[PDB]
Enzyme design. Sequence first.
Site, PDB file in Angstrom:
ATOM      1  N   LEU A  27      21.683  19.131  27.688  1.00  0.00           N
ATOM      2  CA  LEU A  27      22.073  18.085  28.758  1.00  0.00           C
ATOM      3  C   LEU A  27      22.847  17.006  28.191  1.00  0.00           C
ATOM      4  CD1 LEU A  27      18.780  18.335  30.515  1.00  0.00           C
ATOM      5  CD2 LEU A  27      20.949  18.979  31.495  1.00  0.00           C
ATOM      6  N   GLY A  28      22.286  16.843  26.819  1.00  0.00           N
ATOM      7  CA  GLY A  28      22.931  15.762  25.951  1.00  0.00           C
ATOM      8  C   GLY A  28      22.492  15.872  24.482  1.00  0.00           C
ATOM      9  N   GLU A  29      23.323  15.261  23.854  1.00  0.00           N
ATOM     10  CA  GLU A  29      23.501  15.256  22.379  1.00  0.00           C
ATOM     11  C   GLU A  29      23.876  13.992  22.049  1.00  0.00           C
ATOM     12  OE1 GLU A  29      25.509  18.796  21.059  1.00  0.00           O
ATOM     13  OE2 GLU A  29      25.069  18.228  18.737  1.00  0.00           O
ATOM     14  N   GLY A  30      23.062  13.038  21.833  1.00  0.00           N
ATOM     15  CA  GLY A  30      23.398  11.552  21.286  1.00  0.00           C
ATOM     16  C   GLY A  30      23.653  11.921  19.695  1.00  0.00           C
ATOM     17  N   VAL A  35      19.062  16.672  23.992  1.00  0.00           N
ATOM     18  CA  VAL A  35      18.198  16.944  25.400  1.00  0.00           C
ATOM     19  C   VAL A  35      18.827  17.859  25.811  1.00  0.00           C
ATOM     20  CG1 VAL A  35      17.186  15.864  27.427  1.00  0.00           C
ATOM     21  CG2 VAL A  35      18.149  14.392  25.559  1.00  0.00           C
ATOM     22  N   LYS A  57      13.507  16.448  25.008  1.00  0.00           N
ATOM     23  CA  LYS A  57      13.982  15.741  24.052  1.00  0.00           C
ATOM     24  C   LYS A  57      13.481  16.148  22.770  1.00  0.00           C
ATOM     25  CE  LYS A  57      15.677  10.996  24.540  1.00  0.00           C
ATOM     26  NZ  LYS A  57      15.771   9.923  25.555  1.00  0.00           N
ATOM     27  N   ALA A 107      16.673  15.197  35.506  1.00  0.00           N
ATOM     28  CA  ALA A 107      17.586  14.516  36.486  1.00  0.00           C
ATOM     29  C   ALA A 107      18.820  15.182  36.908  1.00  0.00           C
ATOM     30  CB  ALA A 107      17.884  13.089  35.994  1.00  0.00           C
ATOM     31  N   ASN A 111      23.779  11.196  33.990  1.00  0.00           N
ATOM     32  CA  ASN A 111      23.663   9.551  33.694  1.00  0.00           C
ATOM     33  C   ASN A 111      24.450   8.987  34.807  1.00  0.00           C
ATOM     34  OD1 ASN A 111      26.452   8.402  32.461  1.00  0.00           O
ATOM     35  ND2 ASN A 111      26.265  10.886  31.795  1.00  0.00           N
ATOM     36  N   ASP A 162      17.183  -1.869  26.323  1.00  0.00           N
ATOM     37  CA  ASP A 162      18.344  -1.100  26.045  1.00  0.00           C
ATOM     38  C   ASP A 162      18.684  -0.755  27.510  1.00  0.00           C
ATOM     39  OD1 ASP A 162      20.630   0.011  24.863  1.00  0.00           O
ATOM     40  OD2 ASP A 162      19.506   2.122  24.464  1.00  0.00           O
ATOM     41  N   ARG A 166      24.215   3.911  30.882  1.00  0.00           N
ATOM     42  CA  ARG A 166      24.254   5.101  29.939  1.00  0.00           C
ATOM     43  C   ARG A 166      22.747   5.501  29.916  1.00  0.00           C
ATOM     44  NH1 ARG A 166      25.137   0.606  26.636  1.00  0.00           N
ATOM     45  NH2 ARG A 166      23.106   0.903  25.484  1.00  0.00           N
ATOM     46  N   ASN A 167      21.885   4.656  30.192  1.00  0.00           N
ATOM     47  CA  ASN A 167      20.396   5.019  30.139  1.00  0.00           C
ATOM     48  C   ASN A 167      19.627   5.101  31.458  1.00  0.00           C
ATOM     49  OD1 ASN A 167      20.669   5.382  27.354  1.00  0.00           O
ATOM     50  ND2 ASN A 167      20.096   2.991  27.081  1.00  0.00           N
ATOM     51  N   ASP A 180      15.532   6.639  28.540  1.00  0.00           N
ATOM     52  CA  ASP A 180      15.719   6.091  27.228  1.00  0.00           C
ATOM     53  C   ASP A 180      14.966   5.052  26.866  1.00  0.00           C
ATOM     54  OD1 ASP A 180      17.284   8.320  26.659  1.00  0.00           O
ATOM     55  OD2 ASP A 180      18.973   7.354  27.726  1.00  0.00           O
TER      56      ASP A 180
END
Length: 302
Positions: A27-30, A35, A57, A107, A111, A162, A166-167, A180
């Site tokens: 889903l995501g890769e910061g 995630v 996560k 979700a 984002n 934060d 984006r969060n 986050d």
Amino acid sequence: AGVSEYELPEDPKWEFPRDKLTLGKPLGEGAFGQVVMAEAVGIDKDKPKEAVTVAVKMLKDDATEKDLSDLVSEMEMMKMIGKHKNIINLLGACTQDGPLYVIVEYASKGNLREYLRARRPPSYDINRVPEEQMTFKDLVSCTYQLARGMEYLASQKCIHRDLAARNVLVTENNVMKIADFGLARDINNIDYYKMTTNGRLPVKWMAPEALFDRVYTHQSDVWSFGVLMWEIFTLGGSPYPGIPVEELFKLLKEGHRMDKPANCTNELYMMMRDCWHAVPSQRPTFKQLVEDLDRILTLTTN
């Protein structure tokens, strides 16, 4: 605490068996983590054989100690905060004998910045969602929901630190969820949180007290919430457009503030400006923002 020697204690009420977790598409890769979508068999007590879609996560291969520390800290913040409709809720964790997995609500609409940008009013973008274009009422509803989540957060004596589009995550049913919590802090019984000399908070969302006096309170979250509002009413715009953070410091001291978004009423823009009052105590509380926003949304709804 020193993560390289810390052994994660057992916490049976949150522990989830690894064999019941099936990892799926990312889903995501910061920068500090990753995630992935997963299927969690029996994670909701009410349907013990039923698999529910969740987000997981975890660390990446090149994780740092601070990365592990942040993931632990985020898990622990979500335990103490408790449940709210406008917060990504902690569902469980796999903490023993293997990589740390923090399991949270999924979700499906992703984002908030991309969610708004895809719902803008007529670049060539294959991700637009024409059928779900944002109305003014939708934007106010979006804001109200996030204000309710921050009101609940502040009432748990938690600062997020934060806050930003984006969060924020958006669920299948268009519910706004604050996510986050890796930088979030518990300030029960301390008056304010003391910042280090150079923090890990994105400058374009930081209150001046935090930038210049090294102090963070709920009223500092209120400042960030004002920048978030501006992101919402520009439909996923990025703040202080054309102003590099290196010039922003001085501009803030001179009282510089962002202009009114094209889709915003004067009323809502004044609310943003109130959040950006130089004196923290003169910004509204999240409780007041919830009241104002509800009043506006009720009028718009009628």
